[model samples]
Target: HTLVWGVWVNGVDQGDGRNIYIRSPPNNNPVKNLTSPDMTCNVDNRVVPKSVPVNAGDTLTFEWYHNTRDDDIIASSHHGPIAVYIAPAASNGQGNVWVKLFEDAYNVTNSTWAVDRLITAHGQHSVVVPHVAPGDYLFRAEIIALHEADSLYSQNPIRGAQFYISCAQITINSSDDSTPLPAGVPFPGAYTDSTPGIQFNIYTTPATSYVAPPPSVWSGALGGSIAQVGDASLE
Candidate 1:
């Protein structure tokens, strides 16, 4: 299994007529701001999520759903511009808002959780990503249909839709130790998604600068060792 962390703006199983944006961590940076130009479905590209090895208790912020440009779009309790926000869990993993990601089976899926009424398409929101211990993750955001009727044909197409994430790809590597990663250290190897067979590559070298991985490679698990300064290999 390749150990890489790639983030896709609009990757597979991604719906149409909507826009998505991604950002990497440590930098708490975003590829585009909330007020940037409108992103087309295909043109908007994916980048590597923020990757920083920090101690436990560090806060990872996910600023999602900034579609202020769509003023003409209605903002009601049921329909209009939509956004999804999700943070890693600390002990018992909680549910994430799946409807916003075009994945309605959120209630059935075990690996992922849902957070209702937590994300908005127009307002600014922030949350501390949760996880039991130290781990790698790919925080994502998508524009989903809001109408309950749309749930019937959840797989069908829609219209007048768009989405944006101030920072989509967010990786949280918080450890108990307080040592900085050394140069040429490699990240741990694991699949991005926990689903049975999904896998990805996350290779790190001493000379390799902190750069974002490709979109396709971002969704799967990243497998490699977290390297600390002065270590011969990332073990």
Candidate 2:
């Protein structure tokens, strides 16, 4: 039920008639973007073939759709967070080095996470492109479904947690600036099972008392307000 439907650059649909960039488990090789316990360390990879043109301070929207015919519907059972990151492309334009840009972790106020809220409304999530030197970058979007994370490390080849990972190639058009882009961490090296947000148990704990992942959202370049591109109908 976690399929990506489209990727919009600025306000235009760049996915136009093409399949969205998402890992096809089992069928796809070198599953780097997949989440634990099946996650791999594949860096410098390009999930989609097309590279969309974008500008600094532009809005990028990621649209996700359920696997079935149920439009704008996601099972309430899937509870977790949604995160987006960007990394400078390697000289080859396909390397993993990335940094967290926007993360909508579990919210104490609404007792809701990013993916849960997105599914409850519509599947369109948005983030602003960071202002940096002109260059190519990789945009990654992920959803961590933690319903089964309680036993992820205990079980071999964990089965309960689900990760919806995707990446998009982007060409940023901006004037060269002296300011250095914020430092970032490698993908496979970015997260671990011990992370509270990753291994959190949602069943027994009260929603209002949840604490989000560490390293608060980056407030530097590209750290602008995140909002839905359009209105989402309540499910």
Candidate 3:
């Protein structure tokens, strides 16, 4: 039941994502179907999204809460990784212009996952903006909750690993960002029901590892495939 709010870019607060970001129509229900258009952004597109400003090297933070902005972040049991993707702001048919910028998944070394880091940061998942060309883009922030993924999942009844996601329109202005990315991937074509990262189990006993869905971060950006965050039990 988590949704994005309090989006902070540069230094200013951007209130609720729905104000400028795509919203989950009707409710905060998590999206499960990989092929659902909701995978690109959220369920709603009626709101004309506004663009936020940022630099290529800027670090941004996304805030999520159970129901309201002041509520507890999400249950500890709702565990999984976090991923951020970007696409051109212009409508491109089925949206085959998306590329991943940041992703943080399981750290087997410390037996911690991305959700743990977000929880440790008090519900704020921060990421470095990748050095893509300066332009208007759709920034999608997603968190996969693998708790209910033991069996196949659905959308109508809402049964499966929950994909808590939202998209914010952004315009990047950087003086030194020239990272060229390969052709991007489409949402409906990226992840599938049979994907191991999609249908997974998080409650397995000791030492279970994971790689978040739609794997691999774009090669032209910050740190590495696991993001450059130092999550050593930070209080």
Candidate 4:
């Protein structure tokens, strides 16, 4: 029951406080849009008019909250993976292909996933910009709510799993070329109903451990450093 609100650069808001919501697509049918087929992507094809400026190593934060102003935390019933990906800007400034920059499939000790932890912490997440050739890019964040994902076709028959997707436009500025850019996959082609992470069951037979999606984090960009920006505690 949560949606992305805005993106922050360093400690400052990227654009007009209200402009972020204006740029994002409306949640006309939360149940259907959050589920498969439409999956939040096919609903809207528009991109933000402006792109936020950022450095390769700068901190980029994504803020999320319940649709209503009074409720900022996600309901506990929604439990599943959370991820962030980026893609080189398309010729038109929108994006088609995407690379996985950060992902948290499940937790071993607590036996929880990203959404569970995100709810406990109040839905503020961050990622480090990977060092790559200076260019424009599309940043995406998603949460897969598996509460009712067990059935191939739920009672509604049209809905599958819930997919909360959000995208932002960004300009990566960097002089360093040694850092290797991560591999990417096309958006519509990236996921399918059969993917383990997508067609998972959290209510009956929950996952004890998780295998993250392909094109893992860009460790090469970190140059063997142990520091990571995707930790939930940092949020």
Quick one: best TM-score, which candidate? 3
Of 1 and 3, which scores higher on TM-score?
3
Question: Candidate 1's residue-wise lDDT over 29-80, tens digit each?
Answer: 1212112232211123344323333333433322222232212122332222
Ranking by TM-score: 3, 4, 2, 1
| lDDT (Cα, 0-100) at 114 in candidate 1 | 21
Q: Candidate 4: TM-score?
A: 0.78
Kindly give the number of clashing pairs for every candidate.
42, 4, 0, 0
Tens-digit lDDT string for candidate 3 (27-75) = 7778888778877776774435466788887777677767766456788
Task: Kindly give the stretch of ten consecutive residues in candidate 2 with the minimal lDDT sum.
Answer: 24-33
Q: Candidate 1: where are CA atoms >4 Å away?
A: 1-45, 49-55, 65-74, 77-122, 132-135, 151-156, 159-167, 176-235
Pairs of residues at least 3 apart in sequence or in different chains that clash in candidate 4: none
User: Which 10-residue window in model 4 sums to the lowest lDDT?
Assistant: 223-232
Query: Residue 127: error of model 1 in Å?
Result: 3.7
Question: lDDT score, residue 75, model 1?
Answer: 31
lDDT (Cα, 0-100) at 187 in candidate 1? 13
**What are the TM-scores, per candidate, against the unseen true structure?**
0.30, 0.77, 0.84, 0.78
The Cα local distance difference test for each model comes to: 0.25, 0.59, 0.69, 0.61
Candidate 4, residues 1-235, lDDT tens digits: the string is 6666666666565533224432355662343332333442434546656778888878787766676432444778887777777767663223335667777767787777778777655566677787777888777777777787766444545655666777777788863756655555655555655556655666666477455545466554332111222333343
Better of 1 and 4 by lDDT: 4
